[PDB]
Symmetry: C2
Subunit: 111 residues, 2 copies
């Protein structure tokens, strides 16, 4: 019984040319620079299915598509190298933050 | 670089004899009954290492120990059956909620 939920229930970012911050369920991870994205709130049974991430020494860009045809991004800049997650169910987003988003540790089901 | 963080950054619950709610990074999952736990905010590099969960048709009790000797619980009641997670790193907490906490879908590293 019940309506499904996730502990990853909403995402925002702060971005300029790179990722200043990620804001996960209203919890700030990073610095104050860049401009604040609007918050993406996930629906019951909705999860991240695609995700493109540009990264270098820092997280430079973040975009994703959900299983419900919804989109978030791109936010950030054109630097670093691009990696893509496809046919996935993203479960967790961890990482390391300072004044910027230094790394991301994504946990997902690889379908 | 950077200080580690998790997308599972704080836990509270609402509990009576069972689990009315779990509150994950300030996002409410469940109903309004029972009494509100105080919020456990996780520190950088802190994660759930032990966890005892009583469950039946509903989540009945929740307790956990973190890798930093910190504790949360027990909260709830004495019904259902007990399961324990030991030598783990909890990564995600999902589930299904209504007026109560119907299920929990825990994602962890089994060490």
């Amino acid at each position: 019984g019940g309506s499904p939920f996730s502990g990853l229930s909403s995402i925002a970012v702060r971005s300029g040319s790179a990722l200043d911050a990620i804001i996960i369920d209203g919890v700030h991870h990073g610095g104050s620079g860049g401009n604040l994205s609007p918050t993406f709130t996930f629906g019951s049974g909705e999860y991240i299915s695609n995700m493109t991430i540009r990264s270098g020494d820092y997280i430079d860009n973040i975009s994703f598509e959900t299983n419900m045809g919804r989109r978030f991004g791109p936010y950030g800049g054109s630097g670093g190298s691009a990696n893509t997650l496809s046919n996935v169910k993203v479960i967790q987003i961890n990482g390391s933050a300072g004044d910027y988003l230094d790394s991301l540790d994504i946990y997902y089901e690889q379908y």
